[PDB]
Design a protein around this ligand. Structure first.
Ligand SMILES: [K+]
Ligand SMILES: [K+]
Ligand SMILES: [K+]
Ligand SMILES: [K+]
Ligand SMILES: [K+]
Ligand SMILES: [K+]
Ligand SMILES: [K+]
Ligand SMILES: [Mg+2]
Ligand SMILES: [Mg+2]
Ligand SMILES: [Mg+2]
Ligand SMILES: [Mg+2]
Ligand SMILES: [Mg+2]
Ligand SMILES: [Mg+2]
Ligand SMILES: [Mg+2]
Ligand SMILES: [Mg+2]
Ligand SMILES: [Mg+2]
Ligand SMILES: [Mg+2]
Ligand SMILES: [Mg+2]
Ligand SMILES: [Mg+2]
Ligand SMILES: [Mg+2]
Ligand SMILES: [Mg+2]
Ligand SMILES: [Mg+2]
Ligand SMILES: [Mg+2]
Ligand SMILES: [Mg+2]
Ligand SMILES: [Mg+2]
Ligand SMILES: [Mg+2]
Ligand SMILES: [Mg+2]
Ligand SMILES: [Mg+2]
Ligand SMILES: [Mg+2]
Ligand SMILES: [Mg+2]
Ligand SMILES: [Mg+2]
Ligand SMILES: [Mg+2]
Ligand SMILES: [Mg+2]
Ligand SMILES: [Mg+2]
Ligand SMILES: [Mg+2]
Ligand SMILES: [Mg+2]
Ligand SMILES: [Mg+2]
Ligand SMILES: [Mg+2]
Ligand SMILES: [Mg+2]
Ligand SMILES: [Mg+2]
Ligand SMILES: [Mg+2]
Ligand SMILES: [Mg+2]
Ligand SMILES: [Mg+2]
Ligand SMILES: [Mg+2]
Ligand SMILES: [Mg+2]
Ligand SMILES: [Mg+2]
Ligand SMILES: [Mg+2]
Ligand SMILES: [Zn+2]
Lengths: 110, 150, 43, 154, 305, 118, 99
RNA sequence: CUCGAUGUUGGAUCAGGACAUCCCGAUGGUGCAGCCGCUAUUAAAGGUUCGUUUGUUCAACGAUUAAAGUCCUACGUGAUCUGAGUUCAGACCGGAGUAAUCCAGGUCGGUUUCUAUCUACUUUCAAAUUCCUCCCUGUACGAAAGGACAAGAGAAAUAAGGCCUACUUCACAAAGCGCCUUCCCCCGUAAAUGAUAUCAUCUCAACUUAGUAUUAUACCCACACCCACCCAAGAACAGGGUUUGU
RNA sequence: CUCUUACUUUUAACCAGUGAAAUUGACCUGCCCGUGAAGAGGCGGGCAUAACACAGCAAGACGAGAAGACCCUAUGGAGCUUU
RNA sequence: CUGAACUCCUCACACCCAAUUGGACCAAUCUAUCACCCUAUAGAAGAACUAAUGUUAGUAUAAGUAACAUGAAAACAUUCUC
RNA sequence: GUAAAUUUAACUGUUAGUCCAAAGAGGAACAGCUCUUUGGACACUAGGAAAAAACCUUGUAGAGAGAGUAAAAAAUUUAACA
């Protein structure tokens, strides 16, 4: 089946510019109270989620320097310590991961 | 087109002819060439015809600018401000004499479609027709099947 | 319903045409003229 | 017609689906936090919850060891399940994982999600917080509560 | 210019408080309509030939077998009445119809998910919102005061009813499952044509007649099953045992009323009119109401003697 | 008073109004009597709709037409009336409507026998 | 081409419009179009449709005088049709002769 | 009309329509006792089988049915299918011809493209038709053989519309081989009273009756919480729920 | 096959990225009957009719494709046979 | 009474047949001689395109359609699945 | 009563015809059939017969918001009898 006639630009503007074709404005946008950047109400902040992944990656690179190979996971808990911190009362008998950096303010010691 | 062009209603300039007739042609500007076959008919119109035409029309100021040109033209300006430009290129004296006289007779209003061949500001003298013109009045102005004093 | 076979006003089976009253009067008006023409062509 | 169907159709078939979910669960036990498409995480989240239930049964239960051996491709993670993860959620009876939606990835604009095991040693995610109790609306409700409580005691 | 929901700005301490607050209000609103005969009821007229009373709005629980005293087996459908009340009343004149309409709702729903115009209608009525609202055509002598509760004993065993509900939605379907078309054979050369409609019309007309059976969305429409009798009535849970099947899925709201079939005309002479009022009943009814030909579970085993 | 119209001849029985629902077997044919008992304003409405020009303005002219089966008319429409058009047909009188003057004015034409039983 | 052939329709539709307006103005006075036009010619009044339609709108008191004249000449014609010539012609039935 | 292409048999699929009615309905006549039939009037709502041989349409035959209707729709329908036949290129038989080759002939084999631009259509929402059985009844009828109608009751088939308690395919569900429901009519005639025409006469005389439904009623009927989540809702959108928004 | 049904994959539809082809006189591109180069979306008489996308269907547009291979014509060709 | 392009009225007049035939004008270009904001008289000619399934190029329609593509997590080291 | 006709000189195109009336042939006293003859119309305009090549009215050309006309609409309703 082939077109019997050529469709005019008037017919085609009415199909292309139909409200269903148009992009719909979004009203679920708001500002992140921490950084001030934009975000959706149901989605995490891309900026704050990015700074968590940069630090999480650094911690995961230190974990590799301790295991020193594959299939070498521990059977104990793990703790992250920063310059100016020592094992806590509850952080006894764990795998401490030393980080040469000041503890992030958002990263609260538990 | 009529649909592909504009239109106007029949009219006059300052109710001309009502109290007095005023010629609307106000100025005529000819551009002839001393040399040039296109202007041959325009040169002979300037030698014998234009002078007698100005005597009859003293309210029209006529300017004859003889300069080099390939297409001679006559520009007519009217009181209302309209300007009509025309070409007398390769036209005989008789053709230029009837054209210039046509310009003197015109009013300056755009030569376009005229809707009606008539115009009157007072079309009625006994009263423009309206639905109640030929209807009789009823006692107490009652309506069809209207109970009075209920 | 109401088909006339073929073309309407030709052939074997045509659409019937009926004589109106003014068609009669129109023909009679012509006859009265030509009947008076015979009278002036007789002298 | 799909009325009642609870399981999704991913991968190349039923078996490939279990193998996709197994590779995500295995990576979740090693790192305790991963990012993957939202639908694939919501489908694996159920298995991550029931895997801890088998770790609470103990490593002496053959049935529980046959599940971990199958669901954990890396065999160094099996002791971590019975000795690290299960003890951690000993007091809790449910809600071992939290799943959160994250910005769509750039390559294919796919809906993404991050899933983790509660109690990990990783930097806290920027969890959503409810409006403070000191706000205008919440202070108008706190006052209403007090009266309704005060009248009831009377 | 952003929308909001009921718990978008509430804190961790107020969410439980608000939930319990509105929950306790619904309880008090529903427990304040159990005495309709003392709260200035409207006149109670007797039953006259040609009278039409209100119906109910029940919830489809499921299906259960049922045996009679002859040994034959019958399958019944359990319809539970929960939070059924009369919302409003419109007279014959204002109805623009032969009859007079009575509005009834069922299945209390949340107030946080309804429209303001609907919330205010229930606010002055003293009731929580209803999920489904159906209209019943009655006579002038069957009008009931709004806010009056309705129960399953409004019907009696041995009475036929007409159940209306939306059918199960099957989405866009072809002609083989939607209209019962035979289709085309599987083998013997068939080329990509096994479940197609085939010819849709003749060539002469050059078009397709309106109403031509084509693929499309099937189900999810209102259907009525006429001629269903009540085998059993449970008063403790307000449940109606209807014969056979009814349209719709489990846990769906259905419209129930007396049957319009001529054979069952003028059979509501011994039925409650306008409706059953337990508040004013001179004697409470039994736990369950069975039919004469129904063998109760406690009854002894059948013996053809 | 569109319910009390009068047809000439045997048009109540002979005249037929035909329609189609668009569906197969949806061609209906009712007589003027059947339609009149079902809709007392359809006959006058269908006669006017067929006399108006075949253009888009016709549906606008029909909104300015108000038909009522009986002599009752709403107050609003009854307060904006201007003129009552005369009836086209002259309603003839029944033999019980003639006065004793007209009956005695018309002469008797024949002399019946006195021995006829009648 | 449409503009060239439309000059025949314009003249035709105008006369159709005038006649419709004359017919309407004559029914207000209880007359029909043929009885007005035909009997104004019998009174030697040569007024065309265009003028008559203009008078019915802008000169209503003059159009009623023309309708009364046509109705008067129409009634004289009936009276003459009842006689056998003995009775003389009507006052408005006389014809001015031009030599 | 069409050869700068209107694809041609039969069948499958879906059927639309006419009535010149095959069955079912209502009537008149009979060389109609009854049971079966012949004939004519009216009726097109509903229905009108499965198989063996044949490419078949037809036809024959077998077993049934209340009945297995006659026709039109591009001998309906190949941008939905099928290619057995017909109808290219190969080949054989018989026959014709000096041969090439050919035949109303028979026989085996032989590629069926198309991503839908437009028109149209995609829930005509909801009254159902028929057979059999029992009974009436061994009654009416009738020499005998033989053998009803109406009423009533019950049980089925098909169709339409739904459902999953069990059975079965199956298993948070979808299905049938399973279960539930299914409500009005139609007009041909037969009869009274009674004029034209003082009997009579059903009346394109006035009139009365069999004899008629505004097809009845039923269904549907509220509306910015709505970002997000769930769903027995769904292609998308829409719709329902969230007083179950860690 | 009676007589179909269920599930899986592909396709599918939605989001994102990339991005063809035949076809196309112009089009503001309805139905019935009739007419007519004899089968009408466009003519006549009637009926219908706010605008607009998406998904499906294949009755029609004598739908697309290949200047019909059947048939006939051309003092147009060629292959084969021959008294 | 309505009713034509028939006829009258006011003014004007060569100004409605295929093939074919006769005649009156003319765009642009070059040349001769004029002209000199674009013309004149003549002489010449590759001298005028709404149509050849025309030739070349550009851009639309179909159509943002048909169709095409990257196994999973992660420390990007590595491991897992097939 | 009219204004054409023949001759001389020089050329092209047309030479695949349709309906209506009338006289006939063939066919079937069928064909929107085929073949001759007489005339008309069409293959040019307009109006009318519903739409309309062939029927009727009418032809010589423009402008007009004047007029008189041509052709031009279908009629019909039924069976007593000594
Ligand atoms: K004919
Ligand atoms: K059609
Ligand atoms: K052909
Ligand atoms: K008689
Ligand atoms: K199955
Ligand atoms: K099609
Ligand atoms: K084609
Ligand atoms: Mg025809
Ligand atoms: Mg996939
Ligand atoms: Mg569904
Ligand atoms: Mg099948
Ligand atoms: Mg194939
Ligand atoms: Mg297949
Ligand atoms: Mg073609
Ligand atoms: Mg018949
Ligand atoms: Mg049938
Ligand atoms: Mg065919
Ligand atoms: Mg086809
Ligand atoms: Mg074959
Ligand atoms: Mg073969
Ligand atoms: Mg041989
Ligand atoms: Mg083979
Ligand atoms: Mg095919
Ligand atoms: Mg019986
Ligand atoms: Mg009698
Ligand atoms: Mg008598
Ligand atoms: Mg895309
Ligand atoms: Mg083409
Ligand atoms: Mg046609
Ligand atoms: Mg579409
Ligand atoms: Mg297709
Ligand atoms: Mg060819
Ligand atoms: Mg040759
Ligand atoms: Mg040669
Ligand atoms: Mg005229
Ligand atoms: Mg003339
Ligand atoms: Mg002239
Ligand atoms: Mg020039
Ligand atoms: Mg030159
Ligand atoms: Mg050239
Ligand atoms: Mg060009
Ligand atoms: Mg070209
Ligand atoms: Mg497309
Ligand atoms: Mg695709
Ligand atoms: Mg692929
Ligand atoms: Mg010749
Ligand atoms: Mg012929
Ligand atoms: Zn942030």
């Amino acid at each position: 089946a082939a077109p019997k006639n050529r469709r005019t630009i008037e017919v085609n503007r009415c199909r292309r510019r139909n409200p269903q074709k148009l992009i719909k404005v979004k009203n679920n946008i708001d500002v992140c109270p921490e950084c001030g950047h934009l975000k959706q109400k149901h989605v995490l902040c891309a900026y704050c989620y990015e700074k968590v992944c940069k630090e999480t990656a650094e911690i995961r690179r230190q974990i590799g320097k301790q295991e020193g190979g594959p299939f070498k996971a521990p059977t104990i808990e793990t703790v992250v310590l920063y310059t100016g911190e020592t094992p806590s009362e509850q952080d006894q008998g764990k795998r401490i991961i030393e980080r040469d950096r000041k503890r992030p303010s958002w990263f609260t010691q538990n | 087109t009529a649909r592909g062009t504009p239109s106007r209603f029949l009219a006059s300039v300052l109710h001309n002819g009502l109290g007095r007739y005023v010629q609307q042609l106000q100025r005529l500007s000819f551009s002839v060439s001393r040399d040039g076959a296109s202007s041959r008919g325009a040169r002979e119109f300037v030698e014998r015809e234009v002078i007698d035409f100005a005597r009859r029309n003293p309210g029209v100021v006529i300017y004859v600018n003889s300069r080099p040109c390939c297409v001679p033209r006559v520009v007519a300006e009217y009181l209302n401000g309209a300007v009509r430009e025309e070409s007398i290129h390769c036209k005989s004296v008789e053709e230029i004499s009837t054209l210039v006289q046509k310009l003197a007779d015109q009013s300056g209003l755009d030569v376009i479609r005229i809707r009606k061949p008539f115009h009157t500001d007072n079309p009625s003298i006994q009263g423009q027709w309206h639905p109640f013109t030929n209807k009789p009045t009823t006692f107490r102005g009652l309506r069809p099947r209207e109970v009075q004093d209920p | 319903r109401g088909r006339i076979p073929g073309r309407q006003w030709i052939g074997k089976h045509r659409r019937p045409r009926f004589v109106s009253l003014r068609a009669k009067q129109n023909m009679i008006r012509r006859l009265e003229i030509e009947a008076e023409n015979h009278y002036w062509l007789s002298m | 017609i799909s009325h009642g169907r609870v399981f999704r159709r991913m991968g190349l078939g039923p078996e490939s689906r279990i193998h996709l979910l197994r590779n995500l669960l295995t990576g979740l036990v090693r790192h305790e936090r991963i990012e993957a498409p939202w639908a694939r995480v919501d489908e694996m989240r159920g298995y991550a919850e029931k895997l801890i239930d088998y770790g609470k049964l103990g490593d002496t239960n053959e049935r529980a060891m046959r599940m971990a051996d199958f669901w954990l491709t890396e065999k160094d993670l099996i002791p971590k399940l019975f000795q690290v993860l299960a003890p951690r959620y000993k007091d809790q009876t449910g809600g071992y994982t939290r799943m959160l939606q994250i910005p769509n990835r750039s390559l294919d604009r796919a809906k993404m999600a991050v899933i983790e095991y509660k109690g990990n040693c990783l930097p806290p995610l920027p969890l959503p917080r409810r409006d403070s109790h000191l706000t205008l609306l919440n202070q108008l409700l706190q006052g209403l509560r007090q009266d309704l409580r005060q009248s009831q005691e009377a | 210019k952003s929308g909001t929901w009921w718990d978008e700005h509430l804190s961790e301490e107020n969410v439980p408080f608000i939930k319990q607050l509105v929950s306790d209000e619904d309880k008090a609103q529903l427990a304040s309509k159990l005495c309709p005969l003392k709260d200035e009821p409207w006149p109670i007229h007797p039953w006259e030939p040609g009278s039409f009373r209100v119906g109910l709005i029940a919830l489809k629980l499921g299906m259960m077998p049922l045996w009679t005293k002859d040994g034959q087996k019958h399958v019944v459908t359990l319809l539970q009445v929960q939070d059924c009340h009369v919302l409003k009343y419109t007279s014959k004149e204002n109805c623009n119809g032969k009859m007079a309409t009575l509005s009834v709702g069922g299945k209390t729903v949340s107030r946080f998910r309804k429209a303001t115009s609907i919330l205010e209608f229930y606010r002055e009525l003293g009731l929580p919102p209803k999920q489904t609202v159906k209209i019943f055509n009655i006579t002038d002598n069957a009008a009931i005061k709004p806010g009056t509760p309705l129960y399953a004993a409004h019907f009696r065993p041995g009475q036929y009813v007409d159940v209306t509900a939306k059918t199960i939605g099957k989405g866009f379907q072809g002609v083989m499952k939607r209209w019962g078309f035979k289709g085309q054979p599987a083998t013997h050369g068939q080329t990509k044509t096994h479940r197609r409609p085939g010819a849709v019309a003749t060539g002469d007309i050059g078009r397709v007649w309106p109403g031509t059976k084509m693929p499309g969305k099937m189900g999810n429409i209102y259907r009525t099953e006429y001629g269903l009798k009540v085998w059993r009535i449970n008063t403790k849970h307000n449940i109606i045992y209807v014969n056979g099947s009814v349209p719709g899925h489990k846990n769906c709201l259905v419209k129930v009323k007396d049957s319009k079939l001529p054979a069952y005309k003028d059979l509501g002479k011994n039925l409650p009119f306008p409706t059953y009022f337990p508040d004013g009943d001179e004697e409470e009814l039994p736990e369950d109401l069975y039919d004469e030909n129904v063998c109760q579970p406690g009854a002894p085993s059948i013996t053809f003697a | 008073n569109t319910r009390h119209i009068a047809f000439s001849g045997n048009k109540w029985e002979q005249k037929v109004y035909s329609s189609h629902t668009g569906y197969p077997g949806g061609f209906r044919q009712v007589t003027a009597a059947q339609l009149h008992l079902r809709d007392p304003v359809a006959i006058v409405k269908l006669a006017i709709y067929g006399m108006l020009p075949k253009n888009l303005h016709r549906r606008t002219m029909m909104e300015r037409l108000h038909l009522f089966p009986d002599e009752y008319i709403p107050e609003d429409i009854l307060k904006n009336l201007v003129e009552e058009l005369p009836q086209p047909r002259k309603i003839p009188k029944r033999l019980d409507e003639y006065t004793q003057e007209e009956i005695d004015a018309f002469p008797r034409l024949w002399t019946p026998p006195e021995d006829y039983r009648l | 081409v449409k503009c060239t052939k439309a000059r025949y329709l314009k003249k035709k539709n105008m006369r159709t419009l005038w006649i419709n307006r004359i017919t309407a103005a004559s029914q207000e006075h209880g007359l029909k179009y043929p009885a007005l036009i035909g009997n104004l010619v019998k009174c030697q009044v040569e007024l065309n449709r265009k003028v008559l339609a203009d008078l019915a709108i802008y000169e209503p008191k003059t159009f009623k005088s023309l309708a009364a004249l046509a109705s008067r000449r129409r009634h004289e014609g009936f009276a003459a049709a009842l006689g056998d010539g003995k009775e003389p012609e009507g006052i408005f039935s006389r014809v001015v002769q031009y030599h």
